[PDB]
Amino acid sequence: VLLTNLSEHMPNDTRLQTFLELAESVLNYFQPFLGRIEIMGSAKRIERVYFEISESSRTQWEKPQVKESKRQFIFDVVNEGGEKEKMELFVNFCEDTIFEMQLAAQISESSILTVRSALFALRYNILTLMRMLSLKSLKKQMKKVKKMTVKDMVTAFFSSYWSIFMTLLHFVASVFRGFFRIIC
Amino acid sequence: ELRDQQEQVKEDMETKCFICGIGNDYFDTVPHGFETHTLQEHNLANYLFFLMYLINKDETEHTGQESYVWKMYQERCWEFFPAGDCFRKQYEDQLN
Amino acid sequence: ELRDQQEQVKEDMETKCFICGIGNDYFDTVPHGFETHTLQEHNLANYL
Amino acid sequence: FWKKIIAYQQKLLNYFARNFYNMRMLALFVAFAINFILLFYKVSTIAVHYVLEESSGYMEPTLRILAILHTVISFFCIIGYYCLKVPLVIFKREKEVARKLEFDGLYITEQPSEDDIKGQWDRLVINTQSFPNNYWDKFVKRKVMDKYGEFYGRDRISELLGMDKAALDFSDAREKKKPKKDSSLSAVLNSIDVKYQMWKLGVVFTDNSFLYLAWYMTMSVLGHYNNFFFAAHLLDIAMGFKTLRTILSSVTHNGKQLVLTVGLLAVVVYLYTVVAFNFFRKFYNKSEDGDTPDMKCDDMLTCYMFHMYVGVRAGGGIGDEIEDPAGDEYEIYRIIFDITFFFFVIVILLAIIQGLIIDAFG
Amino acid sequence: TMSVLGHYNNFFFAAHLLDIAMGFKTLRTILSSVTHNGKQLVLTVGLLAVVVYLYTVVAFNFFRKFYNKSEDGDTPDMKCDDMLTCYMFHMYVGVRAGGGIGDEIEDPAGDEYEIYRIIFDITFFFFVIVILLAIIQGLIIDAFG
Ligand SMILES: Nc1ncnc2c1ncn2[C@@H]1O[C@H](COP(=O)(O)OP(=O)(O)OP(=O)(O)O)[C@@H](O)[C@H]1O
Ligand SMILES: Nc1ncnc2c1ncn2[C@@H]1O[C@H](COP(=O)(O)OP(=O)(O)OP(=O)(O)O)[C@@H](O)[C@H]1O
Ligand SMILES: [Zn+2]
Ligand SMILES: [Zn+2]
């Protein structure tokens, strides 16, 4: 807190920058726990205040129902709330939120199968297509492709995609079968 | 009407700070200035945490600023909240 | 249209003074300045 | 030999990629033609023989030719998709995997959720020797090695990413090697990376648009066995025409709200059915002959189906269909029943649907 | 030309009542709501015809027995024995009916396709009668706004 106060009140100071790098780790650790607000002080000036935010308080604030309460309060104070009473409504909301967060801290006492089935279907149905490469079909086709044939080339190029589409159909069928067997 | 009210809430929160009420343009004269101001300098969550800290802290143990805010809060007086002013406006020339 | 007209009336009255017509921001450079100006300095009831 | 065959293959790939959209539009035009021909398709008679009536006598060969052409065009459209749109999907997927490896360490510091099919499948592509095949940044492996190698182990990162210490260092040093022959078909097959192809095939199969085109192809094929399957291709106008997409956005913008409004309607109608089944069963006779009484509310399921089917569709509510309550000791209660049914179900809920669509437009 | 033809047939003078759109500008303001989204309205009508054609295909393949429209048993009047006849029936008698095609077709009670036909009628009512007409309504209201 001392170092942060000094850094913010002396923005351009290389000597202070050095200590900031030396204390980066400590500041990184205490960054979540360090609070910072601005108030109009007794000297009729805007003063910045540093305090401590606790881990329990932050977790209770980040719990979803508290976020819903915050959203509802902002909606209300923006739509029907007035400017003259805004800071009174905000303080009342803060008090209620603080009480409920303390109560929650007090009361607190110290699909995967479908994904796996889909992965298995993908692996099986793609290995089925990949086994077509080691069947020595290419070795046998070498002698027959020694002679060039444009029609043969186009036919094979179409047949590759036809096989791909057939494998996709098999994948869809396998996924449906596995999903039904699971839900049964 | 409900849709328009939600849009109005979003626009107000995106274009002016909840606490001070200054527009986003003045803060955005510095890059990322508006969200920096609304998440570090004038965060409403920070004010709520300060109220919790000030309530839970012992009365004898308060510092001068804490005692000042505490007495104004007890007497229900909300001028410690910055209205139309901030650190960047107090020290505009010194900061840059 | 009726709803939009009511919203326009509310927005105009909340963002500019009825008499002088100056925006709320200039008055709000001082805390509570806009409502201070519209309730003490340039109140239409005061003119009436 | 390769210099000409691979060039011809690339020519075909480029042609299909260029003409993908034209083939997509021609596939819709041909489907519209087939359905227009099918609008002249009658039942001729036991066994039901669907027969195409024609004074000209020419429309049936036209139907067969159009069906064959539609199937061929549908196959060409999926080929064009694989030639043109798949590389963008692979590029995006590879980019995401690389950036989650680098700036998140999603396979080093943290692990996929084990319910994220994308992460579990992308686990495979990291070890492949042909990674950033589409993404420009070829140095992702080295970047991750620099970032996480000293902390989690240089060697460990090496087997995780497929990098080879024993080969890289001695290849940088003096190592005698022998190159392959392009004329060697065995070498040509050895060049391919099977695992990366497996990953790519998985990504393509998981792609939504590829699945839609496969469904299009399957329906086109089934159209030969039953010509009326070609009517399913008229559903493609939503993607074919963008103003249709603008119109349908009004419905789809608030789809969750519409579904929940329908569910709320079913709940309210069920409550009304409970009330009718407990008090107003005598009024649900729907048979004119006195010999045969047809009770539509003697059973819970029958009464609920009656209210959902005959009641909601009726413009005056369930009272338009149920008996007259005149001169009965439940007359006022049943009048309240009918009026409230009409006001809540017929007037308000349908108004909610109307307002949802109009609000989506606005 | 219409004024001249009115002398041969006096009822041609009724065509000149179409000039009120240009004569009165508030009529132009009212008609702008329709004409502002005319392309959307035409495409909505086309989409309605496509959806009704799909329903006609389903009915012609499965629910032909329920389209008798003649009371006398001697004369069976099938309205879905032919593709064109069934489509015209669905577009004419079905869309205009407030309860969908089920208001006009036979009763599905006690049949082995009962639940399928109930789904058919309910979906027809929900999509054609409720949603598409709501799309037209919303288009006009959006043009106004
Ligand atoms: N004083 C303020 N404190 C915090 N946010 C403010 C303030 N003034 C304006 N804002 C705006 O509110 C936004 C934050 O909105 P909000 O507090 O509702 O939560 P969020 O970031 O949207 O998410 P969540 O609801 O999940 O916590 C900021 O990004 C900023 O634009
Ligand atoms: N010249 C002005 N005089 C008074 N109010 C003004 C003037 N210019 C703007 N306003 C705005 O009008 C608001 C007052 O509104 P208005 O005079 O309609 O009555 P009100 O305070 O809302 O309540 P009530 O209708 O019960 O008297 C002020 O708060 C201010 O925001
Ligand atoms: Zn602020
Ligand atoms: Zn004024």
Tab-separated table of N, CA and C in Angstrom, chain D residues 39-156:
chain	number	residue	atom	x	y	z
D	39	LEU	N	-45.549	-31.138	-58.900
D	39	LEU	CA	-46.894	-30.597	-58.730
D	39	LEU	C	-47.903	-31.172	-59.722
D	40	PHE	N	-47.468	-32.036	-60.639
D	40	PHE	CA	-48.348	-32.692	-61.598
D	40	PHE	C	-48.310	-34.205	-61.414
D	41	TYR	N	-48.392	-34.653	-60.166
D	41	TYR	CA	-48.124	-36.030	-59.785
D	41	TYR	C	-49.329	-36.578	-59.032
D	42	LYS	N	-49.995	-37.570	-59.615
D	42	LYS	CA	-51.287	-38.022	-59.117
D	42	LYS	C	-51.205	-39.461	-58.631
D	43	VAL	N	-52.265	-39.879	-57.946
D	43	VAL	CA	-52.403	-41.245	-57.460
D	43	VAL	C	-53.317	-42.003	-58.413
D	44	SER	N	-52.829	-43.123	-58.937
D	44	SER	CA	-53.595	-43.956	-59.856
D	44	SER	C	-53.868	-45.308	-59.213
D	45	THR	N	-55.115	-45.758	-59.302
D	45	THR	CA	-55.515	-47.031	-58.718
D	45	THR	C	-56.204	-47.916	-59.751
D	46	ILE	N	-56.381	-50.874	-52.348
D	46	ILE	CA	-55.341	-51.757	-52.863
D	46	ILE	C	-54.022	-51.002	-52.998
D	47	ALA	N	-53.132	-51.516	-53.846
D	47	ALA	CA	-51.836	-50.883	-54.047
D	47	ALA	C	-52.004	-49.483	-54.625
D	48	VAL	N	-51.224	-48.544	-54.104
D	48	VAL	CA	-51.279	-47.149	-54.518
D	48	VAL	C	-50.090	-46.892	-55.434
D	49	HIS	N	-50.372	-46.573	-56.694
D	49	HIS	CA	-49.345	-46.331	-57.703
D	49	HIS	C	-49.311	-44.838	-58.009
D	50	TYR	N	-48.293	-44.155	-57.492
D	50	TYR	CA	-48.080	-42.760	-57.849
D	50	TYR	C	-47.682	-42.657	-59.316
D	51	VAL	N	-48.451	-41.890	-60.084
D	51	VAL	CA	-48.265	-41.782	-61.526
D	51	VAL	C	-48.192	-40.314	-61.916
D	52	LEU	N	-47.201	-39.980	-62.737
D	52	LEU	CA	-47.067	-38.629	-63.269
D	52	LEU	C	-47.952	-38.474	-64.499
D	53	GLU	N	-49.025	-37.695	-64.372
D	53	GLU	CA	-49.930	-37.441	-65.491
D	53	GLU	C	-49.306	-36.361	-66.367
D	54	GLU	N	-49.438	-36.513	-67.682
D	54	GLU	CA	-48.824	-35.602	-68.639
D	54	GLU	C	-49.521	-35.739	-69.985
D	55	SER	N	-50.016	-34.618	-70.512
D	55	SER	CA	-50.559	-34.620	-71.865
D	55	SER	C	-49.443	-34.618	-72.901
D	56	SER	N	-48.346	-33.915	-72.612
D	56	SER	CA	-47.222	-33.869	-73.541
D	56	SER	C	-46.511	-35.215	-73.623
D	57	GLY	N	-46.377	-35.910	-72.494
D	57	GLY	CA	-45.675	-37.174	-72.451
D	57	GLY	C	-44.178	-37.065	-72.270
D	58	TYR	N	-43.658	-35.870	-71.991
D	58	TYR	CA	-42.219	-35.649	-71.965
D	58	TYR	C	-41.693	-35.396	-70.552
D	59	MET	N	-42.574	-35.097	-69.594
D	59	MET	CA	-42.140	-34.640	-68.278
D	59	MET	C	-41.482	-35.723	-67.430
D	60	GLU	N	-41.718	-37.010	-67.719
D	60	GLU	CA	-41.124	-38.055	-66.879
D	60	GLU	C	-39.645	-38.263	-67.189
D	61	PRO	N	-39.219	-38.363	-68.456
D	61	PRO	CA	-37.773	-38.324	-68.722
D	61	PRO	C	-37.127	-37.053	-68.205
D	62	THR	N	-37.849	-35.931	-68.262
D	62	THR	CA	-37.339	-34.694	-67.684
D	62	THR	C	-37.113	-34.845	-66.189
D	63	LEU	N	-38.057	-35.479	-65.491
D	63	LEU	CA	-37.899	-35.689	-64.058
D	63	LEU	C	-36.692	-36.564	-63.754
D	64	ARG	N	-36.499	-37.640	-64.519
D	64	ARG	CA	-35.341	-38.499	-64.283
D	64	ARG	C	-34.025	-37.773	-64.551
D	65	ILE	N	-33.944	-37.044	-65.666
D	65	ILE	CA	-32.729	-36.303	-65.988
D	65	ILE	C	-32.454	-35.246	-64.926
D	66	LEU	N	-33.501	-34.549	-64.479
D	66	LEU	CA	-33.329	-33.514	-63.470
D	66	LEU	C	-32.881	-34.107	-62.142
D	67	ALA	N	-33.412	-35.274	-61.773
D	67	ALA	CA	-32.965	-35.924	-60.546
D	67	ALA	C	-31.494	-36.314	-60.622
D	68	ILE	N	-31.072	-36.901	-61.743
D	68	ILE	CA	-29.666	-37.266	-61.893
D	68	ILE	C	-28.780	-36.025	-61.849
D	69	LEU	N	-29.192	-34.962	-62.543
D	69	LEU	CA	-28.420	-33.727	-62.547
D	69	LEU	C	-28.341	-33.122	-61.154
D	70	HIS	N	-29.442	-33.160	-60.404
D	70	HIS	CA	-29.435	-32.618	-59.052
D	70	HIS	C	-28.484	-33.394	-58.156
D	71	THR	N	-28.481	-34.722	-58.265
D	71	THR	CA	-27.530	-35.512	-57.492
D	71	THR	C	-26.081	-35.196	-57.853
D	72	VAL	N	-25.776	-35.087	-59.146
D	72	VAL	CA	-24.415	-34.756	-59.561
D	72	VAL	C	-24.013	-33.374	-59.059
D	73	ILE	N	-24.915	-32.397	-59.165
D	73	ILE	CA	-24.618	-31.043	-58.710
D	73	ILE	C	-24.434	-31.017	-57.199
D	74	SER	N	-25.218	-31.814	-56.471
D	74	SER	CA	-25.049	-31.893	-55.026
D	74	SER	C	-23.687	-32.456	-54.654
D	75	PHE	N	-23.223	-33.483	-55.368
D	75	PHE	CA	-21.879	-33.995	-55.114
D	75	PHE	C	-20.817	-32.948	-55.446
D	76	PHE	N	-20.985	-32.251	-56.568
D	76	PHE	CA	-20.051	-31.197	-56.936
D	76	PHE	C	-20.029	-30.057	-55.927
D	77	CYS	N	-21.160	-29.757	-55.291
D	77	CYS	CA	-21.205	-28.727	-54.262
D	77	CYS	C	-20.420	-29.099	-53.015
D	78	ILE	N	-20.457	-30.359	-52.589
D	78	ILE	CA	-19.642	-30.760	-51.450
D	78	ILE	C	-18.166	-30.816	-51.832
D	79	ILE	N	-17.853	-31.191	-53.074
D	79	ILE	CA	-16.463	-31.094	-53.514
D	79	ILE	C	-15.988	-29.643	-53.504
D	80	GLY	N	-16.802	-28.720	-54.015
D	80	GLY	CA	-16.434	-27.316	-53.989
D	80	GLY	C	-16.287	-26.771	-52.586
D	81	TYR	N	-17.159	-27.193	-51.669
D	81	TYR	CA	-16.983	-26.827	-50.271
D	81	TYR	C	-15.653	-27.314	-49.725
D	82	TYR	N	-15.322	-28.588	-49.935
D	82	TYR	CA	-14.044	-29.106	-49.470
D	82	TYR	C	-12.859	-28.384	-50.095
D	83	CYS	N	-13.001	-27.905	-51.328
D	83	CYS	CA	-11.921	-27.178	-51.985
D	83	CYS	C	-11.781	-25.745	-51.483
D	84	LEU	N	-12.888	-25.087	-51.145
D	84	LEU	CA	-12.865	-23.654	-50.877
D	84	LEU	C	-13.016	-23.292	-49.405
D	85	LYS	N	-14.049	-23.793	-48.729
D	85	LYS	CA	-14.385	-23.312	-47.396
D	85	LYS	C	-13.670	-24.061	-46.280
D	86	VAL	N	-13.312	-25.321	-46.496
D	86	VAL	CA	-12.613	-26.135	-45.502
D	86	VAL	C	-11.272	-25.523	-45.105
D	87	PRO	N	-10.446	-25.028	-46.037
D	87	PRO	CA	-9.172	-24.426	-45.611
D	87	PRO	C	-9.335	-23.289	-44.623
D	88	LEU	N	-10.384	-22.474	-44.749
D	88	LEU	CA	-10.612	-21.416	-43.770
D	88	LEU	C	-10.903	-21.991	-42.391
D	89	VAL	N	-11.717	-23.049	-42.329
D	89	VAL	CA	-12.026	-23.681	-41.052
D	89	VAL	C	-10.769	-24.263	-40.425
D	90	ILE	N	-9.949	-24.947	-41.222
D	90	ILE	CA	-8.708	-25.514	-40.710
D	90	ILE	C	-7.771	-24.413	-40.230
D	91	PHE	N	-7.690	-23.309	-40.975
D	91	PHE	CA	-6.846	-22.190	-40.575
D	91	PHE	C	-7.291	-21.622	-39.234
D	92	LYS	N	-8.597	-21.388	-39.075
D	92	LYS	CA	-9.097	-20.856	-37.812
D	92	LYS	C	-8.835	-21.820	-36.665
D	93	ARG	N	-9.076	-23.112	-36.891
D	93	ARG	CA	-8.894	-24.099	-35.833
D	93	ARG	C	-7.433	-24.180	-35.410
D	94	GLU	N	-6.522	-24.247	-36.384
D	94	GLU	CA	-5.093	-24.272	-36.110
D	94	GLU	C	-4.616	-23.015	-35.407
D	95	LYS	N	-5.120	-21.847	-35.802
D	95	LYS	CA	-4.799	-20.592	-35.140
D	95	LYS	C	-5.233	-20.606	-33.680
D	96	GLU	N	-6.459	-21.065	-33.415
D	96	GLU	CA	-6.939	-21.129	-32.039
D	96	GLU	C	-6.103	-22.089	-31.202
D	97	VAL	N	-5.775	-23.262	-31.753
D	97	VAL	CA	-4.971	-24.226	-31.002
D	97	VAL	C	-3.599	-23.647	-30.690
D	98	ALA	N	-2.969	-23.016	-31.682
D	98	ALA	CA	-1.642	-22.449	-31.472
D	98	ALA	C	-1.667	-21.353	-30.415
D	99	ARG	N	-2.666	-20.474	-30.473
D	99	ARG	CA	-2.719	-19.374	-29.524
D	99	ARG	C	-3.115	-19.814	-28.122
D	100	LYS	N	-3.928	-20.858	-27.978
D	100	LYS	CA	-4.171	-21.427	-26.659
D	100	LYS	C	-2.976	-22.194	-26.116
D	101	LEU	N	-2.168	-22.805	-26.986
D	101	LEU	CA	-0.905	-23.379	-26.532
D	101	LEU	C	0.041	-22.300	-26.025
D	102	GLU	N	0.132	-21.181	-26.742
D	102	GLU	CA	1.116	-20.163	-26.394
D	102	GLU	C	0.664	-19.318	-25.207
D	103	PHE	N	-0.460	-18.613	-25.351
D	103	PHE	CA	-0.821	-17.605	-24.362
D	103	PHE	C	-1.659	-18.181	-23.227
D	104	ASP	N	-2.014	-19.462	-23.298
D	104	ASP	CA	-2.770	-20.102	-22.233
D	104	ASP	C	-2.146	-21.390	-21.720
D	105	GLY	N	-1.349	-22.082	-22.530
D	105	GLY	CA	-0.797	-23.356	-22.123
D	105	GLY	C	-1.884	-24.363	-21.817
D	106	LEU	N	-2.893	-24.428	-22.687
D	106	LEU	CA	-4.072	-25.250	-22.453
D	106	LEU	C	-3.771	-26.743	-22.497
D	107	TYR	N	-2.579	-27.138	-22.941
D	107	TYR	CA	-2.158	-28.531	-22.865
D	107	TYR	C	-0.888	-28.714	-22.044
D	108	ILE	N	-0.437	-27.682	-21.330
D	108	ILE	CA	0.742	-27.799	-20.479
D	108	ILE	C	0.385	-27.424	-19.048
D	109	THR	N	0.005	-26.162	-18.841
D	109	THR	CA	-0.338	-25.706	-17.499
D	109	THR	C	-1.710	-26.215	-17.087
D	110	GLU	N	-2.650	-26.232	-18.023
D	110	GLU	CA	-4.024	-26.625	-17.768
D	110	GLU	C	-4.386	-27.701	-18.783
D	111	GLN	N	-5.548	-28.313	-18.605
D	111	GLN	CA	-5.998	-29.382	-19.482
D	111	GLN	C	-7.423	-29.128	-19.953
D	112	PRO	N	-7.791	-29.633	-21.129
D	112	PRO	CA	-9.167	-29.457	-21.606
D	112	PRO	C	-10.179	-30.028	-20.623
D	113	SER	N	-11.413	-29.536	-20.740
D	113	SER	CA	-12.436	-29.805	-19.734
D	113	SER	C	-12.869	-31.266	-19.698
D	114	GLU	N	-12.452	-32.071	-20.679
D	114	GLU	CA	-12.830	-33.477	-20.822
D	114	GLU	C	-14.294	-33.623	-21.222
D	115	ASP	N	-15.013	-32.507	-21.321
D	115	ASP	CA	-16.306	-32.468	-21.992
D	115	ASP	C	-16.295	-31.509	-23.175
D	116	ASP	N	-15.125	-30.988	-23.543
D	116	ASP	CA	-14.968	-30.112	-24.697
D	116	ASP	C	-14.427	-30.945	-25.854
D	117	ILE	N	-15.322	-31.297	-26.780
D	117	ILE	CA	-14.944	-32.135	-27.912
D	117	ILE	C	-13.845	-31.463	-28.723
D	118	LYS	N	-13.905	-30.134	-28.838
D	118	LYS	CA	-12.898	-29.413	-29.607
D	118	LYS	C	-11.511	-29.589	-29.004
D	119	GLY	N	-11.380	-29.386	-27.692
D	119	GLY	CA	-10.082	-29.550	-27.060
D	119	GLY	C	-9.586	-30.982	-27.097
D	120	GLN	N	-10.478	-31.937	-26.819
D	120	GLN	CA	-10.061	-33.335	-26.815
D	120	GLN	C	-9.621	-33.786	-28.201
D	121	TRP	N	-10.268	-33.278	-29.253
D	121	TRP	CA	-9.847	-33.637	-30.601
D	121	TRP	C	-8.576	-32.904	-31.006
D	122	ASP	N	-8.434	-31.641	-30.609
D	122	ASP	CA	-7.250	-30.861	-30.936
D	122	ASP	C	-6.017	-31.322	-30.176
D	123	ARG	N	-6.190	-32.137	-29.134
D	123	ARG	CA	-5.038	-32.760	-28.490
D	123	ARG	C	-4.193	-33.535	-29.496
D	124	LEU	N	-4.828	-34.091	-30.530
D	124	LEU	CA	-4.113	-34.947	-31.471
D	124	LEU	C	-3.161	-34.150	-32.354
D	125	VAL	N	-3.605	-32.988	-32.842
D	125	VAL	CA	-2.871	-32.278	-33.892
D	125	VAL	C	-1.542	-31.709	-33.422
D	126	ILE	N	-1.344	-31.563	-32.111
D	126	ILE	CA	-0.113	-30.965	-31.608
D	126	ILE	C	1.107	-31.806	-31.965
D	127	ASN	N	1.023	-33.127	-31.807
D	127	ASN	CA	2.168	-33.992	-32.060
D	127	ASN	C	2.485	-34.145	-33.540
D	128	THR	N	1.591	-33.714	-34.423
D	128	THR	CA	1.807	-33.892	-35.852
D	128	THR	C	2.980	-33.045	-36.333
D	129	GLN	N	3.682	-33.559	-37.339
D	129	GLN	CA	4.812	-32.864	-37.938
D	129	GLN	C	4.391	-31.859	-38.998
D	130	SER	N	3.096	-31.769	-39.304
D	130	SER	CA	2.587	-30.839	-40.304
D	130	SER	C	1.655	-29.801	-39.691
D	131	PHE	N	1.901	-29.404	-38.447
D	131	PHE	CA	1.075	-28.413	-37.772
D	131	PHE	C	1.510	-27.052	-38.327
D	132	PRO	N	0.974	-25.924	-37.847
D	132	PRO	CA	0.511	-24.862	-38.760
D	132	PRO	C	0.609	-25.163	-40.247
D	133	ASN	N	-0.156	-26.139	-40.732
D	133	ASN	CA	-0.231	-26.374	-42.168
D	133	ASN	C	-0.939	-25.249	-42.907
D	134	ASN	N	-1.929	-24.620	-42.286
D	134	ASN	CA	-2.638	-23.491	-42.872
D	134	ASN	C	-2.331	-22.175	-42.180
D	135	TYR	N	-2.169	-22.186	-40.860
D	135	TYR	CA	-1.824	-20.973	-40.133
D	135	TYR	C	-0.406	-20.540	-40.490
D	136	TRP	N	-0.225	-19.232	-40.693
D	136	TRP	CA	1.060	-18.730	-41.171
D	136	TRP	C	2.182	-18.957	-40.168
D	137	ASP	N	1.918	-18.756	-38.880
D	137	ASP	CA	2.975	-18.780	-37.871
D	137	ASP	C	3.507	-20.197	-37.734
D	138	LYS	N	4.661	-20.453	-38.341
D	138	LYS	CA	5.294	-21.762	-38.317
D	138	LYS	C	6.164	-21.977	-37.087
D	139	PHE	N	6.279	-20.978	-36.213
D	139	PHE	CA	7.200	-21.028	-35.086
D	139	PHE	C	6.486	-21.233	-33.756
D	140	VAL	N	5.254	-21.744	-33.782
D	140	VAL	CA	4.497	-21.902	-32.543
D	140	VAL	C	5.177	-22.916	-31.631
D	141	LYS	N	5.709	-23.994	-32.212
D	141	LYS	CA	6.390	-25.001	-31.407
D	141	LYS	C	7.599	-24.405	-30.696
D	142	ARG	N	8.396	-23.616	-31.418
D	142	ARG	CA	9.568	-22.997	-30.806
D	142	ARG	C	9.167	-21.970	-29.755
D	143	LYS	N	8.102	-21.209	-30.015
D	143	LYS	CA	7.641	-20.227	-29.038
D	143	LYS	C	7.193	-20.903	-27.749
D	144	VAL	N	6.434	-21.994	-27.867
D	144	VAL	CA	5.990	-22.717	-26.678
D	144	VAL	C	7.177	-23.356	-25.968
D	145	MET	N	8.153	-23.852	-26.733
D	145	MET	CA	9.363	-24.388	-26.119
D	145	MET	C	10.077	-23.327	-25.298
D	146	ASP	N	10.223	-22.123	-25.847
D	146	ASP	CA	10.870	-21.049	-25.098
D	146	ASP	C	10.054	-20.661	-23.871
D	147	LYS	N	8.728	-20.619	-24.005
D	147	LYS	CA	7.897	-20.116	-22.916
D	147	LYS	C	7.815	-21.101	-21.754
D	148	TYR	N	7.597	-22.386	-22.038
D	148	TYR	CA	7.312	-23.364	-20.993
D	148	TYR	C	8.374	-24.449	-20.862
D	149	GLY	N	9.476	-24.361	-21.607
D	149	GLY	CA	10.444	-25.443	-21.602
D	149	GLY	C	11.269	-25.522	-20.335
D	150	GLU	N	11.713	-24.378	-19.818
D	150	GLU	CA	12.567	-24.390	-18.636
D	150	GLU	C	11.787	-24.802	-17.395
D	151	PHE	N	10.488	-24.502	-17.367
D	151	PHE	CA	9.710	-24.732	-16.156
D	151	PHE	C	9.141	-26.146	-16.130
D	152	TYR	N	8.500	-26.565	-17.219
D	152	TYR	CA	7.891	-27.887	-17.301
D	152	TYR	C	8.783	-28.930	-17.959
D	153	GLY	N	10.022	-28.590	-18.300
D	153	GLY	CA	10.922	-29.567	-18.878
D	153	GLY	C	11.046	-29.465	-20.384
D	154	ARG	N	12.259	-29.169	-20.854
D	154	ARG	CA	12.504	-29.056	-22.289
D	154	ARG	C	12.161	-30.355	-23.004
D	155	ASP	N	12.663	-31.476	-22.484
D	155	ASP	CA	12.387	-32.769	-23.099
D	155	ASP	C	10.896	-33.077	-23.085
D	156	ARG	N	10.225	-32.783	-21.967
D	156	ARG	CA	8.794	-33.036	-21.828
D	156	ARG	C	7.993	-32.270	-22.871
